[PDB]
Design a protein around this nucleic acid. Structure first.
Ligand SMILES: [Mg+2]
Ligand SMILES: [Zn+2]
Ligand SMILES: [Zn+2]
Lengths: 67, 421, 96, 46, 104, 237
RNA sequence: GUGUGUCUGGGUGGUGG
């Protein structure tokens, strides 16, 4: 539901790359070009940052059970 | 080769012509006219001969009623109650979809002659034998009719309870509290019990299942599931077969692999079961469009004309069915008094038009092709691209006459294109 | 295949060349509709494509009519397995 | 002894004693949640 | 059919149905949300009201009398989740992507 | 309604359809909006109905004033009843293109009265105006429409209630901003050309600038007249 | 200066090999 810290296959850190990827997409860069600009050359990491679903945002819509 | 009928709530079988005479047809010509429509045809008139020999004992209506009333579950010893029982059976039990009140015996006789005629057509091979696995001959009892069936018996029990209560209090000559007279708990208890256990009525079990929340696909599959109540242990492998009619309605792949193969089925993506609609606009429109009713026609006029059926009830005939079908399709595409889910089938080889409005019919949207061109044009797509902006919805596309819902029975007579190229 | 570990030459042919003829109850696809297998076909069409012959292979990709016919054949296989299990079970119990 | 629950809606802390009606102290909600334990929570970061 | 019991004699007839939104009771009535029904093991039902004539003439109108409770399929026109936005559905601790179509 | 149904039925002769359309035009000249919704706003699907709509549109061009009144009533019914039809839209295009600032003025007065009265009408009105500007591209001047709408047809009457007055003020502010939506397809093409190059099509650029200046003057007049119209006007807004 | 009671009997549905 949240971006994994490490790529499953090789172990490159991709926990810091989700927000930069979203910013590049908002900058009308093609997701292939966005992934290229983030240095993810191995297609394992491209899969990592490309197939991720940002479901933690949907969970944040619900109220906390205690404040 | 005498013809026999199994009248409801009668222990022993009866000849058909005896039922015809009991309906009020002493003569023989009118009966065969109601059965046979082409008197120049001698073959169907030939095979109906061994039935007619059973008419020797019975010509009068009274003795026919005596025969069809003496074989009931409750024995009848004297004349008048046997006649009353036969009249009650022939008025209320058999063929209620044609008529339940009085002044409908002739329509019931017409339908009975029609079904005998259908049997004779099948016997000669002029008409194909019906297929039990055809999805057009099947109705899907959704939540609506199931809850309605429960509620009917439950309300009947409530009325019985309040009747017993009132009868008990009346003997003392006292008024009451009506709220105290209505034990409100039985309806809620019955609905809750049936919804929880899944036992329907009283016979039928497993209707209600716990929603499978393992994954989202499981929830969607469970909500769109449908079950065939045919015997799971049965050796007949015909109903488990993936019938050809399941195309576009039912998923061909999705089925349990255990003992429930082919009986439990899942809807296709675009499939949409009909919810039901009243047939009164159908009937009022048809009479406005030269639909000559059964009560006004001569029985010989149906030799060439085409029968018209509304929800399985034969009402009237039409001289020219082609333009009738064209204008009905125009009305359906134009979103007039007739709704989209109404099925419009026309058997052409045997002159019949059958209009259906009942619930449980399965249908899916399809694009419409006219003059080898798609009625859908670039303008619809351009509007649909701005769907979130100008609220041009799929409903507008249906109302534009570009798409329509085709039932399985209607799917028989369509010519379907896989793709525009 | 030649090692005999798994598969068959029929599997090779179906994957590469031609899936073949789909059958229901030992015969071709029946006229479930009125004188046609599917509404996409002309009435009284006895040709290969109309009656279940899957021209394409598993590599090229089945056309949707062929997909449906292949589904019918697979369903026949599954039903046969499901009834066969119970029948043979009772026979075996009596035999022992 | 001073058992604390959490309202489902108000997310308020309520001193509910034994064999008491389960009522919120603000909105009167019927559903209450328990607070996380105090003993020790340790996980090896695997 | 209208049930009739007899001397004096009165006739009972039901004319109109009135189904309110789902509620739960105890003290004052309160609307019940599907999450509340799931957690508290309540039947997500709605009360069914009818109006009855008792003519003995001496015509008495029992407007809107309770006769039973009917379960409500979720996300239907009479469920409490009908027509709500995603933000409102989330605020009720309900999943906006949930399709409904089931009873509780 | 007999005109549209008969014209569609006779469609796949020409003289009988034209005669029926002329009779409908005479009736419209004779002359609330329920009949217009029942006849003009009927959503008939077939292309025979499209031929009927074309014949009625030609008659509407022949009967520009009464057609403008009927189209204004149809637009009012479409906005208030939350429904629309392609035939009603085509009739609206014909009425707008036939008589400049006559059909849109009354239509916008009816729309402003409805918006002051009921909500859920600004988005539909904006979409209808955008569709009309894209398709017809003739005499679609919503600036004059809004200017006429400000005070003529029941403008004090539709703002009697506090909520109604607030709706009227919001509708007036939207119409003050709707001048951009009121530009026709030629102005949009000129904007595309200016995006390609600000100097290309200098004469077309000057014509678009003059039309936009007229629209801006109308919007400024609407903004100036709105403040005395609404007592509950917010200073910052 | 200790220590055994573990809600049975039916029905329905889903599932795995
Ligand atoms: Mg096995
Ligand atoms: Zn990697
Ligand atoms: Zn609270």
């Amino acid at each position: 539901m949240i971006i994994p810290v490490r790529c499953f296959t090789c172990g490159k850190i991709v926990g810091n790359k989700w927000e930069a990827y979203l910013g590049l997409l908002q900058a009308e860069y093609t997701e292939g070009d966005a992934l290229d600009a983030l240095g993810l050359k191995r297609y394992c990491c491209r899969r990592m940052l490309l197939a991720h679903v940002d479901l933690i945002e949907k969970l944040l819509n619900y109220a906390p059970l205690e404040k | 080769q005498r013809i026999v009928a199994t009248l409801p709530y009668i222990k022993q079988e009866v000849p058909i012509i005896i039922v015809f005479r009991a309906l009020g047809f002493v003569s023989d010509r009118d009966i065969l006219e109601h059965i046979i429509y082409d008197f120049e045809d001698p073959e169907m008139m030939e095979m109906v001969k061994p039935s007619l020999d059973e008419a020797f004992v019975i010509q009068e209506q009274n003795v026919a009623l005596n025969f069809i009333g003496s074989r009931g579950a409750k024995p009848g010893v004297t004349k008048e109650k046997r006649i009353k029982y036969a009249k009650e059976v022939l008025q209320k039990e058999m063929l209620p979809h044609v008529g339940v009140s009085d002044f409908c015996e002739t329509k019931k006789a017409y339908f009975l002659g029609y079904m005998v005629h259908r049997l004779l057509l099948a016997a000669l091979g002029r008409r194909e034998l019906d297929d039990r696995d055809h999805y057009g001959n099947k109705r899907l009892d959704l939540a609506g009719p199931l809850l309605a069936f429960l509620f009917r018996g439950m309300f009947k029990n409530l009325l019985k309870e309040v009747r017993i209560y009132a009868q008990k209090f009346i003997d003392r000559g006292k008024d009451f509290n009506l709220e105290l007279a209505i034990k409100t708990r039985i309806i809620s208890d019955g609905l809750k019990y049936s919804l929880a256990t899944g036992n329907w009525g009283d016979a039928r079990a497993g209707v209600s299942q716990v929603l499978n929340r393992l994954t989202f696909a499981s929830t969607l599959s469970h909500l769109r599931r449908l079950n065939s109540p045919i015997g799971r242990d049965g050796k007949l492998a015909k109903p488990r077969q993936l019938h050809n009619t399941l195309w576009g309605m039912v998923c061909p792949a999705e089925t349990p692999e255990g003992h429930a193969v082919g009986l439990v089925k899942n809807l296709a993506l675009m499939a949409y079961i009909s919810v039901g609609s009243q047939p009164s606009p159908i009937l009022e429109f048809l009479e406005e469009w030269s639909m000559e009713n059964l009560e006004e026609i001569s029985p010989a006029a149906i030799a060439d004309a085409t029968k018209i059926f509304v929800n399985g009830c034969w009402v009237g005939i039409h001289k020219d069915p082609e333009q009738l079908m064209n204008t009905l399709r125009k009305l359906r595409r134009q979103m007039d008094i007739i709704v989209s889910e109404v099925s419009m089938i026309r058997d052409i080889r045997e002159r019949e038009i059958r209009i259906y409005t009942d619930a449980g019919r399965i249908c899916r949207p399809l694009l419409i092709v006219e003059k080898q061109k798609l009625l859908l044009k670039k303008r619809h797509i351009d509007q649909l691209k701005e769907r979130e902006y100008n609220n041009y919805s799929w409903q507008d596309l249906v109302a534009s006459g570009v798409v329509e819902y085709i039932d399985t029975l209607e799917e028989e007579t369509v010519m379907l294109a896989m793709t525009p190229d | 295949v030649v090692s005999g570990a798994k598969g068959s030459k029929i599997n090779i042919s179906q994957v590469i060349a031609v899936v073949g003829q789909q059958n229901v109850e030992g015969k071709r696809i029946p006229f479930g509709f009125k004188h046609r297998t599917l509404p996409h076909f002309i009435k009284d069409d006895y040709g290969p494509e109309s009656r279940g012959f899957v021209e394409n292979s598993y590599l090229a990709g089945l056309t949707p009519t062929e997909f449906f016919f292949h589904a019918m054949g697979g369903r026949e296989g599954l039903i046969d397995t499901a009834v066969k299990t119970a029948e043979t079970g009772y026979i075996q119990r009596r035999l022992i | 002894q001073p058992m604390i629950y959490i309202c489902g809606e108000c997310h308020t802390e309520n001193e509910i004693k034994s064999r008491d009606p389960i009522r919120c102290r603000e909105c009167g909600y019927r559903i209450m949640y328990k607070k996380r334990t105090k003993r020790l929570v340790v996980f090896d970061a695997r | 059919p209208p049930i009739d019991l007899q001397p004096p004699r009165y006739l009972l007839k039901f004319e109109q149905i009135y189904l309110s939104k789902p509620t739960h009771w105890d003290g004052a009535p309160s609307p019940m949300m599907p999450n509340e029904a799931r957690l508290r093991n309540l039947t997500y039902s709605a009360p069914l009201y009818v109006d009855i004539t008792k003519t003995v003439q001496l015509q008495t109108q029992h407007q809107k009398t309770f006769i039973g409770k009917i379960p409500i399929m979720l996300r239907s026109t009479y469920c409490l989740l009908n027509g709500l936005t995603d933000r409102d559905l989330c605020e009720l601790n309900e999943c906006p992507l949930d399709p409904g179509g089931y009873f509780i | 309604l007999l005109a549209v149904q008969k014209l569609e039925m006779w469609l796949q002769l020409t003289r009988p359809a034209q005669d029926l359309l002329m009779s409908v035009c005479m009736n419209c000249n004779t002359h609330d909006m329920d009949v217009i919704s029942h006849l003009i706003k009927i959503r008939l699907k077939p292309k025979v109905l499209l031929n009927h709509f074309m014949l009625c549109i030609r008659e509407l061009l022949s009967a520009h004033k009464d057609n403008l009144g009927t189209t204004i009533k149809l637009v009012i019914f479409n906005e208030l009843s939350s429904a629309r039809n392609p035939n009603n839209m085509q009739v609206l295009y014909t009425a707008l293109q036939h008589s400049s600032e006559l059909a849109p003025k009354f239509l916008a007065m009816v729309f402003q009265d409805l918006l002051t009265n009921k909500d859920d009408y600004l988005r539909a009105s904006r979409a209808l105006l955008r569709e009309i500007i894209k398709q017809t591209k003739h005499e679609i001047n919503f600036q004059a429409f809004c200017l006429g709408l400000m005070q003529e047809r029941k403008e004090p009457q539709y703002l009697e209630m506090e909520f109604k007055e607030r709706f009227v003020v919001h509708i007036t502010d939207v119409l003050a901003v709707s001048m951009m939506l009121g530009i026709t397809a030629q102005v949009k093409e000129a904007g595309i050309a200016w995006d390609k190059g600000e100097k290309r099509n200098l004469e077309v650029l000057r014509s678009f600038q003059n039309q936009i200046a007229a629209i801006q003057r109308d919007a400024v007049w609407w903004l100036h007249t709105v403040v005395p119209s609404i007592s509950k006007l917010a200073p910052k807004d």
